[PDB]
Amino acid sequence: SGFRKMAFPSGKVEGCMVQVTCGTTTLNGLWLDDVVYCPRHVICTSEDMLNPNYEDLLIRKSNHNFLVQAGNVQLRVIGHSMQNCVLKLKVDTANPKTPKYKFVRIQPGQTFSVLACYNGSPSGVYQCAMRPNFTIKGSFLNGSCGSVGFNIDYDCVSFCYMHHMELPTGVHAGTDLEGNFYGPFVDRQTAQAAGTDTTITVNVLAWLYAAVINGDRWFLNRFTTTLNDFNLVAMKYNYEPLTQDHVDILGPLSAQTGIAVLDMCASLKELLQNGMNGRTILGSALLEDEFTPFDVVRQCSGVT
Amino acid sequence: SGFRKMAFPSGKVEGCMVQVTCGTTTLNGLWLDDVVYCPRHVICTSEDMLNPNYEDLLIRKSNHNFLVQAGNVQLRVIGHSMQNCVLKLKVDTANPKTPKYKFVRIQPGQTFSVLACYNGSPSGVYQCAMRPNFTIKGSFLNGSCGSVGFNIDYDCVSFCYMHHMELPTGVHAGTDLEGNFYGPFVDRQTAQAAGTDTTITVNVLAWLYAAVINGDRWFLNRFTTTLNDFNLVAMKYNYEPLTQDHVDILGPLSAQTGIAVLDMCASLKELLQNGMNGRTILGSALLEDEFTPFDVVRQCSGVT
Ligand SMILES: CC(=O)Nc1ccncc1NC(=O)[C@@H](C)c1cccc(Cl)c1
Numbered sequence: 082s083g084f085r086k087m088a089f090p091s092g093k094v095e096g097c098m099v100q101v102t103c104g105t106t107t108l109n110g111l112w113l114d115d116v117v118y119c120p121r122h123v124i125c126t127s128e129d130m131l132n133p134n135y136e137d138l139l140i141r142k143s144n145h146n147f148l149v150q151a152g153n154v155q156l157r158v159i160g161h162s163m164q165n166c167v168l169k170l171k172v173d174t175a176n177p178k179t180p181k182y183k184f185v186r187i188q189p190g191q192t193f194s195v196l197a198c199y200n201g202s203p204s205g206v207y208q209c210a211m212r213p214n215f216t217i218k219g220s221f222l223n224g225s226c227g228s229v230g231f232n233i234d235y236d237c238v239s240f241c242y243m244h245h246m247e248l249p250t251g252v253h254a255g256t257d258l259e260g261n262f263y264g265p266f267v268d269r270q271t272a273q274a275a276g277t278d279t280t281i282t283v284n285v286l287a288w289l290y291a292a293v294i295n296g297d298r299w300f301l302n303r304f305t306t307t308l309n310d311f312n313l314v315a316m317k318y319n320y321e322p323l324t325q326d327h328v329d330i331l332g333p334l335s336a337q338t339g340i341a342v343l344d345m346c347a348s349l350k351e352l353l354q355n356g357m358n359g360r361t362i363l364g365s366a367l368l369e370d371e372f373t374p375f376d377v378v379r380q381c382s383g384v385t
Numbered sequence: 386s387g388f389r390k391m392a393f394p395s396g397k398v399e400g401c402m403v404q405v406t407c408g409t410t411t412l413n414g415l416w417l418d419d420v421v422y423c424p425r426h427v428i429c430t431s432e433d434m435l436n437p438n439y440e441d442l443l444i445r446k447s448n449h450n451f452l453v454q455a456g457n458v459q460l461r462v463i464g465h466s467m468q469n470c471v472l473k474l475k476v477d478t479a480n481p482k483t484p485k486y487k488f489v490r491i492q493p494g495q496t497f498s499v500l501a502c503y504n505g506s507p508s509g510v511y512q513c514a515m516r517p518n519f520t521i522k523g524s525f526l527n528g529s530c531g532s533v534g535f536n537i538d539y540d541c542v543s544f545c546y547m548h549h550m551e552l553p554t555g556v557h558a559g560t561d562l563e564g565n566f567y568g569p570f571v572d573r574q575t576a577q578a579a580g581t582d583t584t585i586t587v588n589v590l591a592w593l594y595a596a597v598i599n600g601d602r603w604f605l606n607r608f609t610t611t612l613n614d615f616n617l618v619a620m621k622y623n624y625e626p627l628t629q630d631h632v633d634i635l636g637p638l639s640a641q642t643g644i645a646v647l648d649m650c651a652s653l654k655e656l657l658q659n660g661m662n663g664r665t666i667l668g669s670a671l672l673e674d675e676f677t678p679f680d681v682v683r684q685c686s687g688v689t
């Protein structure tokens with residue numbers, strides 16, 4: 082028992098982190114096979130970030146200008162290319178620690194672990210959710226760019242995020258491993274505001290099921306609701322509309338606890354309308370939305 | 386910017402996890418050099434756990450009864466001994482992945498990362514605090530025993546916790562790596578209640594400093610207090626009394642923000658007396674106490 086914001090074990094990803102330096106700029110790269118992936122803004126100075134022409138900037142750069150270091154050993158760069166907002170540096174040595182991996186573009190509301198890194202060295206690991214507005218609420222400082230987000234399926238690492246930018250709001254923006262930003266963000270030092278961030282209803286419901294499984298039952302009531310009635314409440318509280326696909330994914334949790342999804346929706350509706358009244362659920366005084374139904378089942382079943 | 390419950394990268398510890406089986410019981414072991422450390426209750430059946438005589442139980446066990454597996458390879462057991470509540474299994478092979486390590490007995494209020502494991506395989510990593518009542522609020526299921534807690538200082542892993550037991554309360558109890566339980570707990574299936582759990586005042590203060598550093602300043606007020614006046618409030622709200630040692634440790638955070646420790650104590654006093662009024666601090670609707678002043682400085686400076 083007990084429920085925690087749990088991250089995947091980070092070892093397979095630690096073995097891939099390298100330091101990439103170009104001119105005066107140093108950030109992190111991801112070494113998989115004979116390719117190092119890093120944010121393309123490594124070729125920029127803070128002066129260039131105001132309005133960078135990455136094609137023209139990359140033209141003044143050769144293989145020897147990209148310094149890649151894996152711990153204390155230098156990798157020889159034999160090729161460089163730009164794919165969307167990432168640079169791909171071909172090195173002459175395949176990473177001997179390359180795990181079985183995939184590149185995946187996650188959907189908003191899905192979760193992933195982040196291995197924060199500085200100068201190619203891992204500092205920490207935490208669990209994140211891709212917000213419905215395509216930002217992440219991470220913990221990143223200057224030098225953290227190139228830190229990756231991932232999921233693990235037994236022995237396979239699915240890389241889904243590469244950190245690129247911190248908005249003036251203090252929220253984070255980045256790309257998939259093909260260099261496509263999540264959301265409308267561009268890799269430019271300009272005012273970019275994150276749109277309205279809604280609460281991931283299906284995740285809050287999954288977390289309510291985790292609370293019931295782990296003993297916290299005070300919020301359960303004698304009521305039920307319909308998808309349309311619940312969604313009228315969800316709109317008012319900036320919660321994502323619940324669909325039958327969401328109800329379907331909550332099926333295993335509903336079967337485990339014996340509580341119908343719409344009954345759990347009525348508990349959530351009353352929690353939205355009346356608050357927690359000073360009470361807590363799984364040690365939290367607010368409705369947690371960064372656990373997917375898959376995360377709840379995984380943690381409550383012990384998937385390694 | 387951004388503040389998260391961050392765990393240490395787990396790779397060095399993943400390379401040490403093994404599966405230990407004795408009779409019908411399977412749990413996790415920690416392989417360092419030519420020794421495997423695991424909870425001694427591995428020699429018990431659930432029938433034995435009611436009132437186990439570990440000395441008599443261990444007498445009916447030989448080196449060949451302890452099956453140690455590191456992934457898919459079997460380790461040859463050449464010795465076995467009981468040290469307090471842990472068994473030490475001498476194997477004929479030193480772990481090639483043994484990191485630089487230490488065994489440390491942490492103090493209540495200190496934090497550490499847990500690598501939850503099942504059948505010698507890592508499932509996840511999360512940050513914990515040793516509660517003032519010597520329990521931890523973790524996430525552990527049947528099979529998780531032997532999962533360890535640790536801290537990392539550059540390249541050295543300081544192992545501080547080994548998971549042994551879940552109390553009927555749903556909180557967790559375990560030992561240091563010499564087999565000494567934290568708290569009054571015994572490795573027996575008997576009613577053991579965790580004493581009163583207080584809030585780690587110095588950690589809440591450090592987290593208030595992290596909030597100020599990261600932009601959340603609404604709670605700052607025009608007031609100050611004294612250690613004795615603040616402690617009268619701390620007693621009423623089951624908060625650990627603040628000492629000058631605590632004020633001293635908060636020094637770097639006070640210097641960074643320019644806010645005197647006693648001024649931050651007055652903000653905390655008003656937060657205790659009036660609550661958050663529906664507001665949040667670092668995404669939390671309650672006062673967080675599982676970040677030490679060292680964790681705040683580390684996360685806010687990017688120590689790898
Ligand atoms: C100073 C500082 O803490 N930065 C950071 C902190 C946390 N994450 C990233 C960063 N870095 C950035 O956001 C910068 C270099 C930037 C600016 C404009 C566009 C892009 Cl793609 C990147």
Ligand SMILES: CC(=O)Nc1ccncc1NC(=O)[C@@H](C)c1cccc(Cl)c1
Binds near residue numbers: 434549572
């Ligand atoms: C069933 C189940 O989820 N267990 C567990 C869940 C989470 N942690 C540990 C455990 N295991 C225990 O607490 C058990 C085996 C036990 C009982 C009495 C004394 C000790 Cl030292 C140990």
